């Protein structure tokens, strides 16, 4: 394999997400570049993430996360259970993005993850439209009643009828029939897709998991979902990570399958155990139909070699190396 794992607290999906971000090489390098200053890594999320990444890249033994979880404050089962995985992703990404504000690696995070969409609500019978353009760093895909990810995307951009009791509140126009919908303008180099298998059911008053089968491909063409395609850069996406959950409301187990280089050589990361596996273990075996994927990472075929550029010892600033080496000395005696 050539890759090292993470130690297993009740941190659930974190290790899975941490490996996922570590192997986003371009992000890893920018996190290395981010200027930071501190004697303890637990003293900020940027420091702690720099440390975790440094150790994943250099240790031969499983890497600890105590100082990382201390730095962002999620130290109980309940703090992970109250959040979706992208909320933790945002917590880490947003902080690091704001740490890069006015630095040499400024804008790295939106460059890698941010796409553009536009939502609209058009009234049928009156002249009112509420066209709102917004930016995204991840996409929450509905899987209920969807056999595969193409149907998720179809349902995502489907026009919703606001009619009957759903009649749009058009303010001074009163209740109005209208047509809701969203359009993709761009798709980012690195595409985070949550599969919304976990949801609160208000009918039964319970959190539930949907274990139905839901297929996703090695290569994901998304040109059909763009408002305007680019003939020079078809939106073909290459599957990078499959974040997997096993279990029910009484316990569960999280692993991530990752092909770090985007070549197809897949390795399963199960906390401290990292092992080469087959493409079938990574993909089809996680289709479900209680162990299945709840989040995927895809990378644009055209950006693959930039996003997954090698990150050598040379790409880590000496000031950081020295900070981490001093910390390791103080932790050794």
């Amino acid at each position: 394999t050539g890759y090292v794992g993470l130690k297993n607290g009740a941190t659930c999906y974190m290790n899975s997400l941490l490996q996922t971000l570590f192997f986003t090489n371009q992000l890893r390098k920018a996190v290395y570049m981010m200027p930071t200053e501190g004697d303890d890594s637990s003293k900020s999320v940027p420091l702690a993430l720099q440390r975790v990444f440094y150790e994943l890249q250099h240790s031969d033994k499983p890497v600890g996360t105590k100082k990382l979880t201390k730095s962002f404050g999620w130290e109980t089962l309940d703090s992970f259970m109250q959040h979706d995985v992208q909320e933790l992703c945002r917590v880490l990404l947003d902080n690091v993005e704001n740490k890069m504000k006015g630095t040499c690696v400024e804008g790295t995070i939106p460059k890698l993850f941010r796409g553009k969409m536009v939502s609209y609500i058009q009234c049928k019978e009156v002249d009112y439209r509420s066209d709102r353009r917004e930016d995204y760093y991840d996409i929450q895909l509905s899987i209920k009643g969807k056999k595969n990810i193409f149907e998720s995307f179809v349902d995502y951009v489907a026009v919703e009828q606001l009619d009957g009791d759903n009649k749009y509140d058009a303010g001074e126009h009163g209740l109005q029939e209208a047509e809701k919908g969203v359009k993709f303008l761009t798709l980012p180099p690195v595409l985070h897709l949550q599969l919304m298998r976990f949801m609160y059911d208000p009918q039964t008053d319970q959190n539930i998991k949907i274990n139905d089968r839901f297929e996703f491909p090695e290569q994901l063409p998304l040109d059909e979902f763009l408002q305007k395609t680019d003939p020079k850069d078809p939106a073909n996406y290459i599957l990078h990570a499959v974040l997997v959950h096993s279990g029910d409301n009484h316990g569960g187990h999280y692993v991530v399958y990752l092909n770090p280089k985007g070549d197809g050589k897949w390795c399963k990361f199960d906390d401290d155990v990292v092992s080469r596996c087959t493409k079938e273990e990574a993909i089809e075996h996680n289709y479900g139909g209680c162990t299945n994927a709840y989040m995927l990472v895809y990378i644009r075929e055209s950006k693959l070699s930039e996003v997954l550029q090698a990150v050598t010892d040379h790409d880590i600033p000496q000031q950081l190396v020295e900070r981490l080496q001093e910390e390791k000395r103080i932790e050794a005696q």
Binding site: C12, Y13, L77, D78, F80, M81, Q82, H83, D84, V85, E87, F198, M199, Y200, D205, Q206, N207, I208, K209, G247, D248, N249, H250, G251, G252
Partner: peptide, 15 residues
């Protein structure tokens, strides 16, 4: 807004 439990759901999806 449930007693946890090992199924994570955002509280922003619980109202």
């Amino acid at each position: 807004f449930v007693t946890x439990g090992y199924l994570x759901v955002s509280x922003r999806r619980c109202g």
